[model samples]
Target: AGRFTKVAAAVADSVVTIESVSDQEGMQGSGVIVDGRGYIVTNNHVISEAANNPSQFKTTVVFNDGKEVPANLVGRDPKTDLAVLKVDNVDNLTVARLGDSSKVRVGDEVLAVGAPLGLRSTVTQGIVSALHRPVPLSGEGSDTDTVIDAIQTDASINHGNSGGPLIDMDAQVIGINTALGFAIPVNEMKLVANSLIKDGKIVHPTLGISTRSVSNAISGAQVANVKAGSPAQKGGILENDVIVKVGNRAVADSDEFVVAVRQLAIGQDAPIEVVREGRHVTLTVKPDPDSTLEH
Candidate 1:
């Protein structure tokens, strides 16, 4: 009778429960079918044990219609906490329609579809609380830390919901629900998933600059070092430049600036505004796909 009802049904078919087992240890979460060719996407943390101890870990995909099938790990990226899985010999899979996350704004209506606390296909409703916020995640049973440029939602996201699809009012998958209520924006997902699907790995764009933040002045990231022959150097960004904005997102500090830079498309012409010598200067920098070539 309403749009929410329609969108709920539209997204339900694409959600699946991710089950993994590893020698008295296992994890249960959710995943969304992003490709009809048996490609499923979810957080790496859901299947992290698979990567850590592949020989002992076994992964499964539980379909919406109560069918369970063995799944093979295609690829996974730790920094983004995203993983891609391939389900062989599966039929009648529903793929989610992805939306441009850049168009999503605060207060937009959204829904989280996943298996929370072992409950299959749970749907929670809420609005987008914020965007481009930095989220840090610690992979299960691992000592590594991962930070994501997340889409914050007021939706009730809980454990076992990792890797599900967050749908908008248009029934389009705008992000993938990961930590609690934060999602990795679909636009970023598109890039990471594509690379994983193709090369069994992912490459993050790099701006090649060291930055710092201070409370003395306004909010921004101060460039401490711009790497020689790097994109930042070639883009004419000078030392001591205070980065105020990156493309469409405002740089709040050193951390947010790094998040914004990582979210950029490789070889993309991104406009960066910096405060230099009491004046504002905008420079165009194309991020290199060097993937963590830092100062």
Candidate 2:
């Protein structure tokens, strides 16, 4: 965390702030500029203001001197944890390159920079861990190339670090914060952003529920929240349903559940097996028409 941290200094320069000013106390989660021309990339979770507002809400990008510059809300992918915005009339800014996430390996030295605990430009160091994740989006064949992969890290990624960049030794933006951090892979960033940049929720077949792997001896994905009007609710999958299987695939864990779901055809009726009240159960579920590009 010293003079050898020249890479940290340079990358931090581009780690801009994205804040909504409704309550007036709005500094923000960090965002890294990927293009000197004007794009600032961050996670959509950082901007939940778009949820109800959906009107491409007003926001500021404090890139230089902490001065607010109105930024155009380029777009957000609801199901994907990715968002991009454009700011105009800024000073010469530093931009980080989006490195290939697939080429990354475990034990790769990395730096995480963000404004955690109101501390701006806070840099933490860690090594990348192995965790290949699966996507839940139903994409078009061939042209659509994206699968959100998690980049496990040992860095001190804390509060306010939600959207901070997890840069490799080269200081390339390989990942963004999710506490321990996860890189949705740079290829998905570009490919996903193409459909996302068009100002929409960017629908993909989904289960319409959030989940976490159960902490029990039996492996299953525990349903967290089921969105209204979603296939989960419509198909009768409830909160606390420990999903053990999606179609024929026995869900080994959380990651496996995601991969299993991704294999389903959009709107396809698949048998969802779950553990409810200590009993094995099967339920009908049609994939929800949604894609939350969130972390």
TM-score, structure 1 vs. true: 0.78
Q: Please, what are the lDDT tens digits per residue for candidate 2 over residues 1-295?
A: 6642777776767787777655433435777788776888777656656434545456777764666688877777644577888888675877777788878888988887884233454677888876565544323222232345466777776645667788888878787765345555566576666666654435666777778877766567899998898888988889988998888878756767776776677767899998888888899987865444531
**Over the stretch 170-190, how does candidate 1's per-residue lDDT look in tens digits?**
999999988648999999899
lDDT of 2: 0.70
The segments of candidate 1 whose C-alpha lies over 4 angstroms from its true place after superposition are 1-6, 116-121, 140-144, 206-212, 222-250, 263-295
- For residue 236, model 1's alpha carbon misses the true position, in angstroms, by 12
Model 2, stretches more than 4 Å misplaced? Answer: 1-4, 23-27, 50-58, 65-67, 89-91, 115-120, 133-149, 180-184, 207-218, 221-250, 254-288, 291-295
Q: Least accurate stretch of 10 residues (summed lDDT) in model 2? A: 137-146
Error of 1 at 211 (Å): 5.2
